[PDB]
Write an enzyme that holds these catalytic residues in place. Structure first.
Site, PDB file in Angstrom:
ATOM      1  N   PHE A  50       0.834  -1.173   0.000  1.00 34.61           N
ATOM      2  CA  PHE A  50       0.000   0.000   0.000  1.00 34.61           C
ATOM      3  C   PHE A  50       0.879   1.236   0.000  1.00 34.61           C
ATOM      4  CE2 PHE A  50      -3.696  -2.371   0.263  1.00 34.61           C
ATOM      5  CZ  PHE A  50      -3.794  -3.140   1.394  1.00 34.61           C
ATOM      6  N   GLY A  51       2.150   1.080  -0.302  1.00 32.86           N
ATOM      7  CA  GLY A  51       3.026   2.229  -0.350  1.00 32.86           C
ATOM      8  C   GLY A  51       3.980   2.415   0.808  1.00 32.86           C
TER       9      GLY A  51
ATOM     10  N   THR B 279       0.428   1.100  13.852  1.00 36.62           N
ATOM     11  CA  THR B 279       0.761  -0.190  14.408  1.00 36.62           C
ATOM     12  C   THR B 279       1.974  -0.148  15.316  1.00 36.62           C
ATOM     13  OG1 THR B 279       2.228  -0.946  12.624  1.00 36.62           O
ATOM     14  CG2 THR B 279      -0.022  -1.319  12.402  1.00 36.62           C
TER      15      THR B 279
ATOM     16  N   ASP C 123      -1.799 -14.419   3.784  1.00 39.61           N
ATOM     17  CA  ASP C 123      -0.408 -14.182   3.294  1.00 39.61           C
ATOM     18  C   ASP C 123       0.698 -14.473   4.311  1.00 39.61           C
ATOM     19  OD1 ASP C 123       1.573 -13.685   1.500  1.00 39.61           O
ATOM     20  OD2 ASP C 123       0.987 -11.650   0.963  1.00 39.61           O
TER      21      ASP C 123
ATOM     22  N   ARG D 215       8.299 -12.955   5.436  1.00 38.22           N
ATOM     23  CA  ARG D 215       8.286 -11.545   5.033  1.00 38.22           C
ATOM     24  C   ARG D 215       7.248 -10.746   5.831  1.00 38.22           C
ATOM     25  NH1 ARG D 215       6.467 -14.220   0.811  1.00 38.22           N
ATOM     26  NH2 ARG D 215       4.218 -14.236   0.458  1.00 38.22           N
ATOM     27  N   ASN D 216       6.327 -11.499   6.411  1.00 35.65           N
ATOM     28  CA  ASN D 216       5.176 -10.960   7.121  1.00 35.65           C
ATOM     29  C   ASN D 216       5.276 -11.128   8.643  1.00 35.65           C
ATOM     30  OD1 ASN D 216       3.696  -9.709   5.054  1.00 35.65           O
ATOM     31  ND2 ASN D 216       2.639 -11.583   4.494  1.00 35.65           N
TER      32      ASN D 216
END
Ligand SMILES: */C=C/C(=O)Nc1cc(Nc2cc(-c3cccc(NC(=O)c4ccc(C(C)(C)C)cc4)c3C)cn(C)c2=O)ccc1C(=O)N1CCOCC1
Ligand SMILES: */C=C\C(=O)Nc1cc(Nc2cc(-c3cccc(NC(=O)c4ccc(C(C)(C)C)cc4)c3C)cn(C)c2=O)ccc1C(=O)N1CCOCC1
Ligand SMILES: */C=C\C(=O)Nc1cc(Nc2cc(-c3cccc(NC(=O)c4ccc(C(C)(C)C)cc4)c3C)cn(C)c2=O)ccc1C(=O)N1CCOCC1
Ligand SMILES: */C=C\C(=O)Nc1cc(Nc2cc(-c3cccc(NC(=O)c4ccc(C(C)(C)C)cc4)c3C)cn(C)c2=O)ccc1C(=O)N1CCOCC1
Lengths: 261, 263, 274, 263
Positions: free
Chosen positions: B18-19, B79, B126, B130-131
């Site tokens: 999302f950027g 967050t 997902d 990486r998450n």
């Protein structure tokens, strides 16, 4: 003991630890590979008396040694032929895109040979993929078993030499140069890893020196992408710290059998 | 929702799907990460509308959502900050020289988190190294959960896109795009492999379209070097073809612990 | 393949004379370790992992690399090719990566120190430029520091030999997009002048004390925007005089970018101005 | 440089000092022989940087180097193809039974080649019938001239080596490694003896060690049966102990030409 009347030389296989090896026909009938031992490589004086023991090692998963040419320097060592060549070279090629079922039979082919050698109280002393050779039947066999004892090359013989199979050596060989039936077991498990990793180098991001310490420190190879969890437990079993708590080949044959059927 | 008057924008944390993401202080005490939700990246109505169902989620091992800022364009998502950064970058490092006991625990922190979502009927969709981000205490936390739902890139959401998490996806997703916790289960197993392999890309020598065929032909991944015989058994269990035969995160967490008692 | 018949001489090192001592991390070619050569010299040793390198090309061509000698290059001692993996043996830089050294807020510089770092690299690059040799991946990550705190350039010209599609292609994940000029990004036109563009970015990395360029943008967004004439701003601890030098590296027209020789003269002039 | 994409590999032609040689065609047309240089067999960097001098050596009686492929390994050396193969075999056929005129014409072909090399200050350094080829036209041509310089084999490069051409070397080569125009001359005389003897090995009942010893005591090859006295006079003139009293290839060609008009 093979007279060279029978022996025709056709094409050369490679130049090995004992120098040049050749392929031809012996008896104009039975296809052979032909070791032409390079002079000063081998302790022939040692090898000649043994050679009866080695000729009396018969198994279908062994690359049998038909005989010798002892009335020559060089000596000629004559073996059966495997027209499909190196296990490693074979494993790497994805052209088959080898099936898992295939790799497992390939381990079985070997375990079979090693079980026989084990019951003969005979050690390979250098069991690796490179020392396995595949035939026209897609069947893999064990080669050069117990011939390491006669190598005259300080890089090979010595535990810190450039040629010593550090990556197939158990904790004890690396430390105490103690070769047993169980050091053979340690190597077989690594071969199994080589087969499952389709020709990958064991400990490839480690050198031989470093491999030899971390083996003591307790770490082990992965379970290659194509190995099942059971198939892994079998290989990992070869790798117990204390040698007397590793399986025999006989045992490994049963575990392997279970998996197939 | 947060008053954007209480956010101070400090350093950069890079860019995301999302950027851009930033780091800041919320209220000048809580150090926070702010997403700025760029134009066309996200399904914006159909974000905040569920958001309370993502917000109300709280667990020791999820990165905590603090709020949003939706009165403004672009919207902020606020967050918990994580110092030790990427799991995938954290993992690789020589400076750690990761101990195997350390990997399984990291597997435990991830599984604990996933189980809570499982309880609350919440998909991640997902899951991968990486998450996951790492705090000051080397604690692993799972982030960005549910956000794949609102993504407005087709390459990402289309099975065959040049973004779609193909190497982390089950046969039933790759072929019929069916998501459950069991495709979240398939994701954890691959994650274990990632961790035990110290950052290797799964199925490295196969391309995304190739892998998507190959996993659909039965095969899988190599239990990593540091993976025990029993350790692989857990990670493998996630990769059952029929999703029903895969385990729950609750069972996995137990299985992991039972290895944990011993190892 | 090996080095036999190619006339490498002492460049083909006998690995028997190598001791391996500690791990140093991993790069594009895999593992690198620290060790000794002949029991007398600190070295770093690359072990070239399988599938990572165009070994046949490297071996045929690497004599040019071995013959590169400058005190600001991390020099190559030689190679071991009668074996696999290949070993690349180089001098050891005790203070490691430049960015960590800069990023070390534990170390606080005078700006004159940063300029000296830029000079070191420029001197290395001017030498390569003189030898018509492209580095092809000039970046702070590819710069190392000795125990005198001198900065040296590493892994010049080895980019040619990477087989990773994602590193090689300008549209790949690992490609040095943030250090590439428009002609490289649009047309894959590498020249001495792409190295110049990168150097300007490296100067920015130095004066920003290790920030990543364009980091609000993705790799693909950065590529697009640079082609739209996006340029980096002036780092806070960078003078206009200094900013002018780095900025000159980024002219849209390659021909209008300075040479490394010109750049070195500019850097010396700033130093000597003030 | 030759683009190997232009080359076909159609037949094997055996193995030499540098390895395998194969027959092929270049650009659909030319018949060519291709040396595939075995790694470590040749000092390739040295050959390449002097190779231009060789390529430009242009004479009807030389086996012409056409080009090379070096952006590769193994490196290629591409030459004219010679259909009737090595001379020594051709000579050893009574399947072909020669007139003596054919034999003399063979000597002239080689002498012509040598006269040209001699004019270029270029030494063959291993002239012998083993290094002579016969084309489909029955022309003898000298081959592999100067390539001795680039051999990596001490067995061949050392005077006492098993592979050294002791039988073709003058005493100043055996004693002092003194190669000159005059050494090629001595070899040529031995080559004339090879031709007229129909391929017999020189000094047959002596080993290399014996041969060296004895030639310094003045031992010389006897007149072959098919060789006239006038011809024997020419080859023998090659074998004077003192190098400066041996003829030139120019003088030798003249003598051969004289025999041809008269004999
Ligand atoms: C000699 C048996 C024969 O008749 N061979 C034969 C040859 C050709 N043409 C041919 C062959 C070669 C060739 C092939 C192998 C090896 C070499 N030698 C070297 O490469 C070499 C020699 C010396 C040196 C030194 C540095 C001096 C030590 C280095 C390398 C050569 C030269 C090369 N060319 C150019 C050829 O044209 C054709 C056909 C035959 C043949 O087998 N037959 C001819 C027709 O009857 C049937 C058999
Ligand atoms: C990896 C090369 C390969 O595949 N070669 C190959 C072999 C082959 N058939 C046979 C080859 C040999 C052979 C040839 C050379 C050297 C050796 N080894 C030794 O002599 C040797 C090794 C180890 C030891 C110790 C004692 C363990 C140290 C001693 C000696 C050998 C064994 C032997 N036999 C019996 C063969 O049958 C056929 C074909 C190839 C080959 O190159 N290819 C076939 C597949 O496609 C083409 C490539
Ligand atoms: C590995 C580099 C690193 O260490 N980065 C880093 C991270 C960090 N902590 C946080 C990072 C982020 C963050 C930053 C950018 C992008 C994202 N991802 C997304 O926004 C995103 C991901 C996935 C999706 C879907 C749903 C899968 C499509 C959507 C969006 C993220 C998450 C966020 N938070 C909250 C972080 O806390 C801190 C610091 C670093 C870092 O730069 N370093 C670590 C310490 O050493 C210095 C370097
Ligand atoms: C940033 C960590 C650090 O400081 N590391 C460090 C390095 C060091 N000395 C050397 C390291 C290397 C080395 C090690 C691993 C990988 C690489 N890179 C590559 O091999 C590589 C790079 C680029 C390419 C392409 C082709 C251009 C893409 C290919 C391959 C390198 C270079 C090499 N040398 C020669 C080193 O000297 C020493 C010490 C440290 C370190 O850990 N510290 C610094 C001092 O304080 C403690 C920490």
């Amino acid at each position: 003991e093979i007279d060279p009347k029978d022996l025709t030389f056709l094409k050369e296989l490679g130049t090995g630890q004992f120098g040049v090896v050749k392929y031809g026909k012996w008896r104009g009938q039975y296809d052979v590979a032909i070791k032409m031992i390079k002079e000063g490589s081998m302790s022939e004086d040692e090898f000649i008396e043994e050679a009866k023991v080695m000729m009396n090692l018969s198994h279908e998963k062994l690359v049998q040694l038909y005989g010798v040419c002892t009335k020559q320097r060089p000596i000629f060592i004559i073996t059966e032929y495997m027209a499909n060549g190196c296990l490693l070279n074979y494993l790497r090629e994805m052209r088959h895109r080898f099936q898992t079922q295939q790799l497992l039979e390939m381990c079985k082919d070997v375990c079979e040979a090693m079980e026989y050698l084990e019951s003969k109280q005979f050690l390979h002393r250098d069991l690796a993929a490179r020392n396995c050779l595949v035939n026209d039947q897609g069947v893999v066999k064990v080669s050069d078993f117990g011939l390491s004892r006669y190598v005259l090359d300080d890089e090979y013989t010595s535990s810190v030499g450039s040629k010593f199979p550090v990556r197939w050596s158990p904790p004890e060989v690396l430390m105490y140069s103690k070769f047993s039936s169980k050091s053979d077991i340690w190597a077989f498990g690594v071969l199994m890893w080589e087969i499952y990793s389709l020709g990958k180098m064991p400990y490839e991001r480690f050198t031989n020196s470093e491999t030899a310490e971390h083996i003591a420190q307790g770490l082990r190879l992965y379970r290659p992408h194509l190995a099942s969890e059971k198939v892994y437990t079998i290989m990992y079993s070869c790798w117990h710290e204390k040698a007397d708590e590793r399986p025999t080949f006989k045992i490994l044959l049963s575990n392997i059998l279970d998996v197939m059927d």
